[PDB]
Design a protein around this ligand. Sequence first.
Ligand SMILES: [Ca+2]
Lengths: 65, 147, 685
Amino acid sequence: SMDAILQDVKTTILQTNEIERFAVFSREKTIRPRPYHLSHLFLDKHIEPALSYGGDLDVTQGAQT
Amino acid sequence: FLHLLAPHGLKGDVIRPAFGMSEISSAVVFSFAIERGDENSGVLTFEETSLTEQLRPAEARETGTVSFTELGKPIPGITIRIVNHQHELLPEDHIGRVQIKGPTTMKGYYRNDEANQEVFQADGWFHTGDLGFLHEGRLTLTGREKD
Amino acid sequence: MIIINGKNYHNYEIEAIAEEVPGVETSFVAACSVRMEASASDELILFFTPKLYEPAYIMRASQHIKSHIATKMGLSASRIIPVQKHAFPKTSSGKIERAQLKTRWQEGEFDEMIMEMDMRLENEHTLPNWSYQKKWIPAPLDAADKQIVGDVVIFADPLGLADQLKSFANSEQTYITVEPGQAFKQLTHTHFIIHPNRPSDYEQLFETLRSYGVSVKHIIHLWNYTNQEDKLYVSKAKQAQKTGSMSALFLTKAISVYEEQVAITFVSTHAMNVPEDHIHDVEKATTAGLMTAVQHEWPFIKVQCLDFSLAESVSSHSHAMAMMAELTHDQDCHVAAYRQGVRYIPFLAPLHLEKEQKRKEPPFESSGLYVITGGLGGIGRLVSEQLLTSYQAHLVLLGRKEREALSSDQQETLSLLEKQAKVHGGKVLYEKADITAEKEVEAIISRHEVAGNRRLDGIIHFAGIIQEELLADMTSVSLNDMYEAKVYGTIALHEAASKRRNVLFLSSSSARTLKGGMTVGAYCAANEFVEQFAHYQKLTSTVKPYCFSFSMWDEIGMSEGSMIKGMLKERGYLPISKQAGFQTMLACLMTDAPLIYTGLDRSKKEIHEMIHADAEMQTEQTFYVFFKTDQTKAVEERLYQSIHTCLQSRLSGEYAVHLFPEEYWKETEDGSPDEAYFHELIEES
Ligand SMILES: [Ca+2]
């Protein structure tokens, strides 16, 4: 019944006339549970110097020239 | 120097580091903690790995660390900072271009304008070109540009 | 024009290059930019429409575009947001209403599928579904025409179960009964006395039995088949070990050297906490937890533990009757529990954090008093950093050494926390203390309860050493060095939390306890207690516990010098990063589940056999189709729906159609489909 399905899919691929040659094969695989999305569990808000001064200098004391 | 001349009466902390240019009218920082007995006083050792990031202090090693002598705090009357390659202020421990401002800054190069555009970019903050960090509020030079 | 740090690009080129990518509908592409609140640069947001609106086709092209931009233009697209054709906004004049899409996206029409994309790639928003609970499920026994054929040793109980079991013995077998006492004393050739805690008396027992010609083929250990005591100090914990979990060590060590097959059978009362049971002598759990490592280290020693309840039941299924049945019947599962004359075995069941959620944010109070053990450990810091930044908590860290004697690696990771606390308004102290002393704990807590006028808000108990050591070399102190933190310490901390109301209790364990492990008897023995303890607290006291038993840590190193400990991954124990795990803890903390196993791949067999045991895994058939059309009428959508309609209600399983563009189809010369190129693609997928 498995390859019987494969055959009835090819005939379904021929239902569309715009396609004139194709190829189809199947695979069996194990599922890995879908992860969560952080938005679904968590709340929104959780998801989200070098400058030295030497000290003032009194420049107005003493010779200005 | 100190150990070889000590028997002749030179005291251990006489030495006085200072970083000054011609454009700034000479020294702008002074280090007083340079003792004979204490080779680490005024001397900062860091890991070579952290030179690009936050400097990580390290121990005296022959291959793997670097020692920088502290020049000291800016002089009474001026302010010093350091900037990144985009001319933004840097964090405490990151290395950057030393930039100095105060009343000791020259008028400007005589008959040379584009040189003025490089040195004091904006607000008279002078680009020394010397690369160094400013830790604890006391400047510590790392290396001059292209030297 | 759109700009990115360093250069700017014309959106006509971006969209034009993206239209080369197979599956991109021509002229339905958009390029924008936005500076997130980081403002460090401008990121490229990119919209497009696929010739098929189904995530397989989309995810296929989203990657192909993101890379094709990095190849041809030198940059990668931050996000790529798919949008159906019938809702792609354009003006009558063919202009692409770009600024509308951005504003339409910040509102989140495309959230619905930008999530479905995040899920399929297990993105930073993935939060894998890998957490389960232990659920006690009924499993009866099969009919058994086999009978016991051997001489049996039996460490007799004081309640009379031993007496019952002897009456069933066949006429050919001799039953050697052993009682506990002050030291070795042989009363008869079939009656003995030994000091349960002295290992010599065990090997001497068997040695003198080898002489008398008794071939020991079965051992029964009814020594933690006790009657209930309600007080639970630490002494009672230390003391019950020697009559129980330690005894099991010595007994197995002794009979292991003869290297002869033998059927040991431990028997407990109130060691396992199932639903509807009002008594829980949890101190007995280490016994059953240590023996997990036996069948791995000494394959010739079959082991199975049983737990019964003395909650009054007028011999509805006499303990003796069940006892015999389990002995004759092919030892299958390690542990089982008879409660009301009903055999139960422990199975796993997924947590389903969303559907079981009972709370929207972690249950930590803002500036609450929280005491932490081994907060300087890799997993402790994660929790300490959190309780100091996000919450501004008064933390007191308890270590066993003194501050000055800490690892230079630790003293730093503490100063970090001291600084990281000063700048977040929290406080963090450290105190040398004996985690094991009931009174020394209440004294040290009370002090911190008055400094800040807050009552204790929670205990986080991650302290623990690991020693990989085999039952062969396992000294009696090896265990008592293990129990110090994970048992005797745990009991002292709970001694305080029980005197307050609704205190939070966090506990770390391991999933090795599920199936057992070689050279980890000490680990499994203690962790089987910490896990079973959470249930003791929910039954005894106000405390609200959360116990995470993790599969693996990246703290054991991804290299480890033994990448064959990763082989344990191959049986279904994933490595979990700090963030991945830490995030899990929070998610679970929002669910009231008190015990939770995390890091388990329900795909791999060992785990799958723990959730179902009998039903086979579930397969999903995935069809792959390839294209070659006469005209250019995009039939993808018309075709997908055509195949999906042929499969409707006709497979009896889980199916999915996966479609490929036209411009992947290839043909070998001589007029045949290039099947080599297809079977190659399906795997690279
Ligand atoms: Ca195209």
